[PDB]
Ligand binder design. Structure first.
Ligand SMILES: CN(C)CCNC(=O)c1cccc(-c2cnc3ccc(-c4cccs4)nn23)c1
Length: 293
């Protein structure tokens, strides 16, 4: 009964089909947290496994770019995962509020995302649902680091053991191997990082169709473009990283630590363009609006 007795519940930060996240304060310290609240009534043994796996994954991952777990509390009927509170909102909503936004800032963001995908992979965790809603920002007052969130769909892998761990993911970000029902692993997070990198540069997604089945065929072919004019001002090194992240052969796809050594990431001041990209800001506003529905 540790949560009800020591915490005060506040407003809802987000809601889904099977959980809710609410802000909360610890009554003794006055420190503020985010509580993920899961109904544990009448779960199967399969669901109990998934929920204790989520709590295990969140306890293990300690990294400046991953939401930090403060306590996992089991009350009768409910489970609470209590994370340190990050107040900076979604990454993509902070970007559209910037008056200066360049490839160097995109590279900065993707470098933090990559550090976190890397830390997951070193601990043998595949996130499987990288997407803008899962990319929070720490307060500008605390450094504005990017925070990877929500490991509810994550899996634990041993070494490079690859298998068909079932369908999971969000359609625009799904890798070709998942869509083929082929065995997959860590590379599915690098594919998603390439879709996010792409959107971070131009404000719209690399694969898109109003017909989801045609969307899937485009993904499986790996058929994205760098159309003029917007891509004409983008450096070739940034286009090269996308190319290595969006390869349909998962064995040849670049890995997270290899991508942290790409010159566009680790030689940012000399390689990434520093011009403001106002057309990306505008497209991203339309991107963010559509995803809100
Ligand atoms: C879309 N998913 C992210 C899940 C639903 N949550 C939201 O939409 C949301 C929106 C705005 C802010 C927050 C927020 C603020 N501080 C924290 C700390 C930790 C976490 C999470 C850990 C595991 C899952 S959320 N969320 N969190 C969540």
């Amino acid at each position: 009964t540790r949560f009800t007795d020591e915490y005060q519940l506040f407003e809802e930060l987000g809601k889904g089909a099977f959980s809710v996240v609410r802000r909360c304060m610890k009554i003794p310290t006055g420190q503020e947290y985010a509580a993920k609240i899961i109904n544990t009534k009448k779960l199967s043994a399969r669901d109990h496994q998934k929920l204790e796996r989520e709590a295990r994954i969140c306890r293990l991952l300690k990294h400046p770019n991953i939401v930090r777990l403060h306590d996992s509390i089991s009350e009768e009927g409910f489970h609470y995962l209590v994370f340190d509170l990050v107040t900076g909102g979604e990454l993509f909503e902070d970007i559209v509020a910037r008056e200066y936004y360049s490839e160097a800032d995109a590279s900065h963001c993707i470098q933090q995302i990559l550090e976190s995908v890397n830390h997951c992979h070193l601990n043998g965790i595949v996130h499987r649902d990288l997407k803008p809603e899962n990319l929070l920002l720490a307060s500008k007052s605390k450094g504005a680091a990017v925070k990877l969130a929500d490991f509810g769909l994550a899996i634990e892998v041993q070494g490079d053991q690859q298998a068909w761990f079932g369908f999971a993911g969000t359609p625009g970000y799904l890798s070709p191997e998942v869509l083929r029902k082929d065995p997959y692993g860590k590379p599915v997070d690098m594919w998603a990082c390439g879709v996010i990198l792409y959107i971070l540069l131009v404000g719209y997604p690399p694969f898109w169709d109003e017909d989801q089945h045609r969307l899937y065929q485009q993904i499986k072919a790996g058929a994205y473009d760098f159309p003029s004019p917007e891509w004409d001002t983008v450096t070739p090194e940034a286009k090269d990283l996308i190319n290595k992240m969006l390869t349909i052969n998962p064995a040849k796809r670049i890995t997270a630590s290899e991508a942290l050594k790409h010159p566009w990431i680790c030689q940012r001041s000399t390689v990434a363009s520093m011009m403001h990209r106002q057309e990306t800001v505008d497209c991203l506003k339309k991107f963010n609006a559509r995803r809100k529905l």
